[PDB]
């Protein structure tokens, strides 16, 4: 439930802000100020095609497409499990006794449906 | 999936841009840059791998919730048949 | 606020439906209503009455009659100065044209 | 799409004279052929009260537009009470100036012709009798669509139509027998026999054929320009007293 | 053109918070009111150049409005995407049920044909082969005699 | 290029202020680099904000087009669901199904009667 | 995502004003009482305020401003109640279209539904596709069930046209409002799936031409004695000609005798005073086009009828195609016969008005409908 919003939030709150601010300007612990400033400006300037708000949108779309392709095999496998006497095979009264509180008992329909299982 | 995300996080980094242009101390200056930049991605690789774990586990526990509501068990059916047996006995 | 809803509906209807200088002469000669903006004229006549006053009140129909009479006097003086303007071979009027008609009437 | 309006003519007149006055008033030239045609050229007519003199006053102009193109088909007979009439199409002003000239020069009386019900039945009978060059009358057929438009209380029954397909029409005609009048001897007795709706008394509006003609109560709409001889013969027979 | 001053003031507030985040880290040499009035001294000094930027100085487009618009667009997109996922699952289940019912009908047709062919080999000579007018007279006489 | 012109003007003002702070930055040592840290954060936030405004606009147009395509596919899947369930309800209650059901019941009754009569 | 009654949509206020201005004051009082009892907003203290307002003889405008500005749309359930009461009030605005309910071999299936458990089943079937809200009440005069099915869309929630499905109480014919969009097919298919619960039901439509009111479609195709006779056989649908065997024999039509007129069978109509004979002729026309004895309109007004008469003379299939139009067809036909334009001796039964609102062909003297 709501997987694409979680993907986009994870990207925009764990990669982009983490690689734009701290990976660029907080790397001055080893230092002069001018050299780390100029190399931060250089790595910021020669990067303006991957950290855009469109390329990460396409990346989240590709992530969702890959997870949907993975989800397809899982949905086909979990629908092709042991049937365990599934629905659309019993009568009305059997599934009504399964779901509880039928509010209308009728012995003739119980008889005509108990021979169908 | 993970192969896209790791390639994306390893592409946009300092190690692919600064070391292209790389005298006695400055060679040792960016030598410590390559280890610290490899340190933060290793703390990042654990989070994105745990993110794919907590996604598919929450996904498959959702998929088994919708499937079992549209399937049947071998206990509630026997309980309903016990009730039907009691009614026909009466 | 049904009056507010009716006013918004009429404003939407006006915004959707209702929304070589020779045309304006024949256009504004068949118009009947007033042509001076109302509440700045009311503020102006309030400032004029402050010279010869005391909190003197004002009925709205009196200011309407004043606006009508002032517009009538202004278009009368302007129609009379147009003839003296074209008489002096001036299609474009001037302040000298609205000096003789302001002089010879009194 | 040539809507043929119809007007009446009081007195019998010749058209070879006075046409130069129309040319002088019009500054055009028109051709007026004199066709002494005769209905059912089969010899069971007696050659008496069967012939007419037709004056197709064409306007040989540029035919780029059909609404300005207007013929004037005439008819006449020197034996009946009302001898002559005409019929005009188009939306030209030349129709008005030529009816002005016809009212002014010869001194005649013009009035529009309103249609009956049996007149419309005979026109639908006559508008399908085709004349060939081999002196015989071959009859084509059309999927006719009759029409009615009566007036009732609170507009109960607005308008209702009787549509007969082509093969059914040919079957009724071949089952009635050999005659030159299908739509007054076969179909209308069949509709009266199977429905009880006498179409002679019901209010007709538009006897419409299968795209061929469209007979109305005030005009006739066709697909081709020309009008047949029996059609104008039935129209001239209808306006007698 | 006041939106530029508003965006500059919001960016100044965010940069002031970000600088306080680093001044809390570099306060090892400095205790509570020592760096308090010092940052307050640069608070008006940053406001001085901000006021001088108005002396130094088209559309009106903010950042938070278009950010919330993008958030609403992405939320609606995720909602419609999950709806398409649910409808894809529903269409898959109904396609499975359709193919199941069609193969059941074809299996019953082939089983009926096989049963007819094995009954044609089977032996029913006296009591069955006179009809194998049959069931209609029974229903007639049954609803007549109230059988 | 009005946003780019505002970016260039703010970047020039920030570059002049940062050059002045750097020339002034030759216990006041923490007070020296503090102002250039302010100007660094201001310049980076302003440039990133303008580039992000442009990127948010173009990604909003992109997401609008993709959302229109997603809504079209949703309408198509709705039509497919309705057609499939209609085919199911027409096949499960068809005349041929009931005819073969009655013929199978008659064949089962006939083979049971023939077995017990034999 | 099945919307409950407490959700409010986003609709224009002035169209709800225009709709609620088409109702009397006492139904507005009942609506205010029921809505305040169920939802409320802005006990019996606020009831006497309207009790004193309706006693003073106020207009409908101040009370409709009261109801639209103590709740300020109201909700989905209030809109459903407003529209359904508007349906009860003026029935001439809508347009119904009937459809039969077949199952199995082709035998018709009576619905016999219950209003309680059907509604949640229909809603939980519809909620897996769209946003939906259903509402079902009983007509106060006629024994039918009218169900208002409303749907929504997301560009907050843009409303759709409300779709009505009218269930009669004990008939296999189910009326629905005339639509042909994919939502109409979705709602009808969902009802056809959820009404069954034991064995599958399909909805083959029995007619293609819509009919106007709910009284008319109930008298035509619901559970009624007029369901098949409908024409010159309207006397058998009311039995005004015979009495019970326990009645008197002195007042019997065998003993008293009815005044009749000698029919004519020769072709004596195409060649064309005594007011008793005129009254008997009008009585003959009343007999042929109606039952025994305004004054031209039939029991049911029929909008559109298209016949087809495929006779057979000397092994030739001769078809004609009658078509009709107007407000009430057979009433206007009786009026045209009343002016002595149609010979009533040769008016067949299918033209006379029987099997009303059924446009079908005729193959050798017996009517059959069209699919």
Q: What residues contact residue F39 under an 8 Å CB cut-off, 6+ apart? A: F14, F17, F18, F21
Q: Which among D96, D85, D89 has a CA at the least distance from the CA of D71?
A: D89
Of A25, A48, A54, the CB nearest to F40: A25
Q: Which whole-number Å values give the CA distances from E56 to C86, E3, E90, F10, F16, in the listed order?
A: 53, 15, 63, 11, 13
For the four alpha carbons of D41, D45, D47 and D52, in that order, the dihedral sign comes to: negative
Beta bridge partners of D73: D87
Mutate to test the interface with F, among A51, A53, A59, A60 (most CBs of F within 10 A): A53
Conformational region of residue D155, where left means phi above 0, alpha means psi within -120 to 50, and beta covers everything else: left
The H-or-E segment that residue B35 falls in is helix B31-68
Shortest CA distance from G114: residue in chain A? A104
| Residues 6+ positions from B70 with CB-CB distance below 8 Å | A86, A87
Contacts F70 to G, Cβ<8 Å: none
Structure tokens at D215: 């007979």
Within 8 A of G17 by CB-CB distance, chain C residues are: 2, 5
Helix (H) or strand (E) holding F106: helix F95-117
Question: What is the least distance, in Å, from the CA of E117 to any CA of chain G?
Answer: 26
Q: Containing H/E element for D237?
A: helix D229-238
Alpha-carbon torsion angle A82, A86, A90, A96, nearest 10: 140
CA-based nearest residue to F79, from G182, G202, G154, E85: G182
Q: How far is G289 from chain D (nearest CA, A)?
A: 14
Contact F67 E80 (CB under 8 A): yes
- Cβ–Cβ of B48/A14 closer than 8 Å? yes
3 state SS of D54 = strand
Q: CB-based contact (8 Å) between A33 and chain B?
A: no
Strands laid side by side in the D207-208 sheet: D72-75, D84-88, D2-9, D219-222, D213-215, D207-208
d(CA E114, CA E97): 25
The label of the residue with tokens 């992405």 reads: E74
Judge whether G327 is closer than 8 Å to chain C, CB to CB. Answer: no
D183: Cβ–Cβ under 8 A, 6 or more apart, which residues? D121, D122, D124, D125, D128
User: Which residues, in sequence order, are CB contacts of A97 under 8 Å at separation 6+?
Assistant: B80, B83, B84
Chains A and B touch (3+ CB pairs under 8 A): yes
Dihedral angle of Cα C2, C4, C5, C6, to the nearest 10 degrees: 90
Q: Is E93 on the interface with A (CB under 8 A)?
A: yes
Q: How far is G169 from chain E (nearest CA, A)?
A: 29
Q: What resolution in angstroms, rounded to 1 decimal? A: 4.2
Partner-chain contact A97 B84, CB within 8 Å: yes
Q: Pseudo-torsion of CA E55, E60, E63, E65, nearest 10°?
A: 140
Decide: C46 and C58 in contact? Cβ < 8 Å: yes
Q: Any idea which residue has 């299968």 for tokens?
A: D210
CB contact under 8 A, F52 and A53: yes
β-partners of residue G150 are G133
CB G194 within 8 A of CB G129: no
Helix, strand, or coil (residue D113): coil
Interface probe with F: pick from E44, E72, E77, most Cβ of F within 10 Å: E77
Residues of E in contact with G129 (CB under 8 A): 87
Q: Residues D54, D35: contact at Cβ < 8 Å? A: yes
Asked if G128's CB is within 8 angstroms of E90's CB, the reply is yes
Closest Cβ–Cβ partner in D165, D195, D198 for G319: D165
CB contact under 8 A, G197 and A92: yes
B44-51, long-range: CB < 8 A, 24+ apart: B44/A14, B44/A15, B44/A18, B44/B9, B45/B6, B47/A14, B48/A14, B48/B2, B48/B5, B48/B6, B48/B9, B49/B2, B51/A10
- Please report where in the chains the tokens 């260039």 appear, as a residue: F8
Distance from the Cα of G199 to chain A's closest Cα (Å) equals: 9
Alpha-carbon gap, residue G367 to D95, rounded angstroms: 54
What DSSP string runs through C42-101? HHHHHHHHTT--------HHHHHHHHHHHHHHHHHHHHHHHHHHHHTT-SS--TTHHHHH
The whole-angstrom separation of Cα A8 and Cα A3 is 9
Question: Strands, DSSP E only, in D32-139?
Answer: 32-35, 54-57, 72-75, 84-88, 129-131, 137-139
Cα distances from B29 to residues A29, B21, B25, G155, in angstroms, run 12, 13, 6, 57
Rg of chain C over Cα atoms, rounded to whole angstroms, equals 20
Q: Which residues contact D157 (CB under 8 A, 6 or more apart)?
A: D150, G324, G325, G326, G328, G329, G331, G332, G333, G335, G336
Helix (H) or strand (E) holding F116: helix F95-117
CB contact under 8 A, G185 and F82: yes
Among the partner residues F25, F40, F59, nearest to A54 by beta-carbon distance: F59
The tokens of A37 are what?
A: 């400033």
Beta strands G361-363 and G308-313, pairing class: parallel
DSSP letter assigned to residue D112: B
Is the separation of the CB atoms in A78 and A33 below 8 Å? no
Nearest to D70 by CA among D59, D56, D55: D59
Span between the terminal Cα atoms of chain B, in Å: 61
D5 CB-near residues (< 8 Å, 6+ apart): D87, D88, D89, D112, D218, D219
Tally of CA atoms within 13 A in the half-sphere of D149 that contains its CB: 5
Q: What is the 3-state secondary structure (H, E, C) of chain G?
A: CCCCCCCCCCCCHHHHHHHHCCCCHHHHHHHHHHHHHHCCCCCCCCHHHHHHHHHCCCCHHHHHHHHHCCCCCCCHHHHHHHHHHHHHHCCCCCCEEEEECEECCCEECCCCCCHHHHHHHHHHHHCCCCCEEEEEEECCCCCEEEEEEEEEECCCCEECCCEEEEEECCCCEEEEECCCCHHHHHHHHHHHHHCCCCCCCECCCCCCCCECCHHHHHHHHCCCHHHCCCCHHHHCCCCCCCCCCCCCCCCCHHHHCCCCCCCCCCCCCCCCCCHHHHHHHHHHHHHHHCCCCCCCCCCCCCCCCECEEEEEECCEEEEEEEECCCCCHHHHHHHHHHCCCECHHHCCHHHHCCCCCCCCEEECCCECCCC
Q: Which residues of G touch C1 (CB under 8 A)?
A: 69
D219-222 vs D2-9, strand pairing mode: antiparallel
* Nearest-angstrom CA–CA distance, G287 and G280: 10
- Sign of the CA dihedral running E31, E32, E37, E42: positive
Q: Mapping DSSP to helix (H, G, I), strand (E, B) and coil, where does residue D224 land?
A: coil
Is F93's Cβ below 8 Å from some Cβ in E? no
The DSSP result for F30-99, as a single string, is HHHHHHHHHHHHHHHHHHHHHHHHHHHHHHHHHHHHHHHHHHHHHHHHHHHHHHHHHHHHHHTT-HHHHH
Token output for C97: 């044209």
Q: Enumerate long-range contacts of B68-76, CB under 8 Å, 24 or more apart.
A: B70/A86, B70/A87, B71/A81, B71/A83, B71/A84, B71/A86, B71/A87, B72/A84, B72/A85, B72/A86, B72/A87, B72/A98, B73/A84, B74/A84, B74/A85, B76/A98
CB contact under 8 A, C6 and G69: no
Closest-CA residue in chain F for A34? F22
The answer to whether D191 touches D197, Cβ cutoff 8 Å, is yes
Tokens 């499905």 found at: G165
Q: How far apart are CA E98 and CA F85, in angstroms?
A: 8
Q: Looking at the partner chain, which of B4, B37, B72 has a beta carbon nearest the beta carbon of A98?
A: B72
Q: CB of D9 within 8 A of CB of D40?
A: no
Q: Does E146 touch chain F (CB under 8 A)?
A: no
Nearest CA in chain G to C9: G14
User: From the CA atom positions of chain F, what is the Rg in Å?
Assistant: 39
Among E79, E82, E89, the residue with its CB nearest the CB of A75 is E89
Distance CA E59, CA E65 (A): 14
Question: What residues in G contact A109, CB-CB < 8 Å?
Answer: 198
Q: B22 in helix, strand or coil?
A: coil
* Three-class secondary structure of residue B64 per DSSP: helix
Tokens of D177: 């027998």
Contact check, Cβ <8 Å, A57/F44: no
- Work out the minimum CA distance from A99 to partner chain B, whole angstroms: 9
Distance CA D129, CA D137 (A): 6
G246's CB contacts (< 8 A; 6+ apart) are none
From residue B63, how far is each of B66, B71, D131, E90, G109 by CA, in Å? 5, 12, 84, 13, 39
Resolved by: cryo-EM
3-state secondary structure chain A: CCHHHHHHHHHHHHHHHHHHHHCCCCCCCCCCHHHHHHHHHHHHHCCCCCCCCCHHHHHHHHHHHHHHHHHHHHHHHHHCCCCCCCCCCCCHHHHHHHHCCCCCCCHHHHHHHHCCC
Cα separation, D2 vs G100, in Å, equals 50
Locate D38 and state its tokens.
Answer: 């005769």
d(CA D81, CA D240): 6
**Distance (Å) from the C-alpha of residue G146 to the closest C-alpha of chain A?**
25
Q: Which helix (H) or strand (E) holds D208?
A: strand D207-208
Residue in F closest to G129 by C-alpha: F78
Question: Do residue E76 and residue G128 have CB atoms under 8 angstroms apart?
Answer: no
CB contact under 8 A, G17 and C1: no
Residues G265, G284: Cα–Cα separation, whole Å:
15
Q: Which among D156, D174, D202 is the nearest to G331, CB-wise? A: D156
């Amino acid at each position: 439930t709501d997987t694409y919003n979680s993907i986009s939030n994870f990207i925009e709150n764990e990669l982009t802000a983490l690689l734009s601010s701290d990976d660029y300007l907080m790397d001055d612990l080893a230092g002069p100020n001018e050299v780390c400033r100029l190399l931060k400006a250089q790595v910021i300037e020669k990067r303006k095609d991957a950290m855009s708000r469109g390329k990460q949108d396409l990346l989240s779309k590709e992530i969702y497409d890959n997870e949907s392709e993975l989800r397809a095999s899982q949905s086909q496998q979990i629908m092709e499990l042991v049937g365990d006497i599934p629905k659309y095979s019993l009568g009305s009264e059997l599934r009504n006794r399964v779901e509880g509180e039928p509010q209308s008992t009728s012995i003739e329909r119980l008889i005509e449906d108990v021979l169908k299982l | 999936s993970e192969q896209l995300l790791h390639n994306y996080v390893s592409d946009s980094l300092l190690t692919t841009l600064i070391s292209f242009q790389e005298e006695q101390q400055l060679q040792h200056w960016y030598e410590l840059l390559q280890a610290r930049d490899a340190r933060v991605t290793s703390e990042l690789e654990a989070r994105i791998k745990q993110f794919f774990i907590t996604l598919r586990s929450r996904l498959l526990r959702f998929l088994e919730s919708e499937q079992l509501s549209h399937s049947l068990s071998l206990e509630t059916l026997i309980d309903a048949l016990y009730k039907i047996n009691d009614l026909l006995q009466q | 606020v049904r009056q507010k809803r009716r006013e918004k509906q009429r404003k939407q209807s006006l915004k959707r439906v209702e929304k070589l200088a020779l045309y304006e002469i024949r256009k504004y000669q068949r118009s009947t209503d007033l042509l001076i903006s109302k509440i700045p004229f009311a503020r102006l006549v309030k400032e004029v009455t402050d010279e010869f006053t005391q909190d003197l009140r004002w009925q709205s129909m009196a200011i309407m009659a004043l606006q009508e009479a002032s517009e009538a006097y202004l278009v009368g003086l302007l129609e009379h100065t147009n003839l003296l303007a074209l008489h002096a071979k001036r299609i474009t009027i001037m302040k000298k044209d609205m000096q003789l008609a302001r002089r010879i009437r009194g | 799409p040539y809507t043929w309006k119809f007007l009446g003519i009081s007195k019998q007149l010749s058209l070879e004279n006075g046409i130069a006055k129309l040319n002088q008033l019009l500054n055009l030239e028109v051709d007026l052929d004199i066709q002494t045609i005769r209905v059912p050229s089969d010899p069971d007519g007696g050659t008496a009260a069967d012939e007419y003199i037709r004056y197709e006053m064409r306007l040989d102009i540029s035919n780029l537009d059909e609404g300005t193109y207007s013929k004037f088909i005439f008819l006449g007979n020197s034996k009946m009470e009302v001898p002559m009439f005409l019929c005009y199409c188009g939306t030209d002003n030349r129709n008005e100036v030529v009816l002005q000239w016809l009212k002014a020069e010869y001194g005649v009386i013009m009035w529009p012709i309103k249609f009956e019900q049996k007149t419309m039945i005979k026109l639908a009978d006559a508008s399908i009798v085709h004349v060939t060059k081999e002196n015989i009358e071959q009859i084509t057929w059309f999927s006719s669509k009759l029409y009615f438009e009566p007036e009732t209380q609170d507009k109960n029954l607005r308008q209702f139509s009787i549509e007969i397909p082509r093969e059914s029409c040919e079957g009724l005609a071949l089952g009635y027998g050999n005659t030159m009048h299908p739509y007054n001897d076969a179909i209308v007795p069949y509709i009266y026999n199977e429905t009880g709706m006498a179409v002679e008394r019901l209010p007709l509006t538009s006897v419409i054929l299968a795209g061929h003609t469209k007979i109305m109560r005030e005009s006739i709409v066709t697909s081709t320009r020309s009008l047949r001889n029996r059609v104008l013969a039935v129209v001239l027979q209808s306006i007698q007293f | 053109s006041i939106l530029r001053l508003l965006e500059t003031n919001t960016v100044s507030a965010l940069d002031s918070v970000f600088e306080k985040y680093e001044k809390e880290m570099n306060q090892m040499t400095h205790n509570n009111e020592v760096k308090r009035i010092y940052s307050k001294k640069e608070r008006l000094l940053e406001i001085i150049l901000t006021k001088i930027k108005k002396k130094l100085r088209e559309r009106d487009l903010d950042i938070e409005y278009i950010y919330s618009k993008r958030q609403f667009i992405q939320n609606r997109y995720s909602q419609e995407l999950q709806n398409n996922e649910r409808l894809e699952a529903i269409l898959s289940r109904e396609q499975n049920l359709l193919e199941e019912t069609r193969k059941l009908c074809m299996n019953l047709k082939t089983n009926n044909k096989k049963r007819l062919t094995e009954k044609l080999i089977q032996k029913d000579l006296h009591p069955v082969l006179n009809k194998a007018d049959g069931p209609v007279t029974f229903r007639n006489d049954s609803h007549e005699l109230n059988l | 290029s009005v946003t780019t012109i505002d970016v260039l003007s703010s970047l020039f003002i920030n570059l002049f202020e940062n050059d002045l702070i750097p020339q002034a930055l030759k216990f006041r040592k923490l007070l020296y680099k503090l102002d250039l840290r302010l100007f660094q954060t201001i310049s980076d936030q302003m440039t990133r904000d303008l580039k992000d405004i442009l990127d948010i606009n173009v990604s909003n147009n992109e997401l609008c087009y993709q959302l229109k395509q997603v809504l079209a596919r949703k309408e198509d899947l709705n039509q497919q669901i309705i057609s499939v369930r209609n085919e199911i309800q027409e096949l499960k209650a068809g005349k041929d199904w009931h005819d073969l059901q009655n013929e199978q019941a008659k064949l089962n009754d006939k083979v049971k009667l023939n077995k017990r009569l034999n | 995502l099945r919307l409950e009654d407490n959700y409010v949509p986003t609709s224009d206020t002035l169209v709800v004003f225009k709709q609620l201005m088409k109702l009397p004051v006492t139904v507005l009082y009942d609506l205010t009482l029921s809505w305040f009892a169920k939802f409320g907003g802005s006990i019996y203290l606020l009831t006497e305020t309207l009790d004193l307002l309706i006693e003073k003889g106020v207009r409908r405008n101040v009370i409709v401003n009261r109801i639209l500005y103590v709740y300020w749309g109201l909700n989905v359930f209030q809109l459903a109640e407003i529209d359904c009461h508007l349906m009860i009030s003026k029935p001439e605005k809508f347009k119904w279209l009937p459809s039969k309910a077949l199952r199995g071999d082709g035998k018709p299936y009576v619905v016999k539904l219950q209003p309680a458990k059907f509604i949640e089943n229909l809603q939980t079937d519809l909620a897996k596709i769209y946003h939906c809200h259903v509402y079902m009440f009983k007509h106060p005069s006629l024994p039918v069930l009218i169900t208002r099915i409303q749907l929504f869309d997301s560009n907050p929630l843009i409303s759709r046209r409300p779709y009505y499905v009218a269930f009669p109480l004990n008939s296999p014919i189910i009326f629905h409002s005339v639509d042909k969009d994919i939502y109409a097919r979705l709602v009808l298919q969902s009802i056809s799936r959820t009404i069954s619960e034991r064995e599958t039901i399909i909805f083959k439509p029995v007619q293609k031409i819509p009919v106007k009111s709910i009284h008319n479609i109930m008298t035509l195709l619901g559970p009624s004695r007029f369901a098949e006779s409908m024409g010159p056989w309207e006397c058998y649908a009311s039995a005004n000609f015979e009495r019970s065997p326990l009645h008197d024999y002195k007042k019997h039509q065998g003993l008293t005798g009815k005044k009749v007129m000698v029919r004519e069978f020769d072709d004596s109509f195409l060649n064309d005073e005594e007011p008793e004979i005129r009254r008997l002729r009008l009585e003959k026309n009343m007999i042929k086009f109606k039952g025994s004895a305004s004054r031209y309109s039939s029991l049911v007004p029929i909008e559109k009828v298209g016949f087809t008469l495929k006779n057979e003379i000397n092994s030739r299939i001769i078809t004609i195609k009658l078509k009709f139009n107007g407000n009430d067809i057979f009433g206007g036909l009786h009026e045209l016969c009343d002016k002595n334009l149609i010979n009533i001796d040769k008016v067949p039964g299918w033209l006379a008005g029987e099997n009303g609102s059924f446009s079908g062909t005729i193959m050798n003297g017996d009517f059959q409908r069209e699919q």
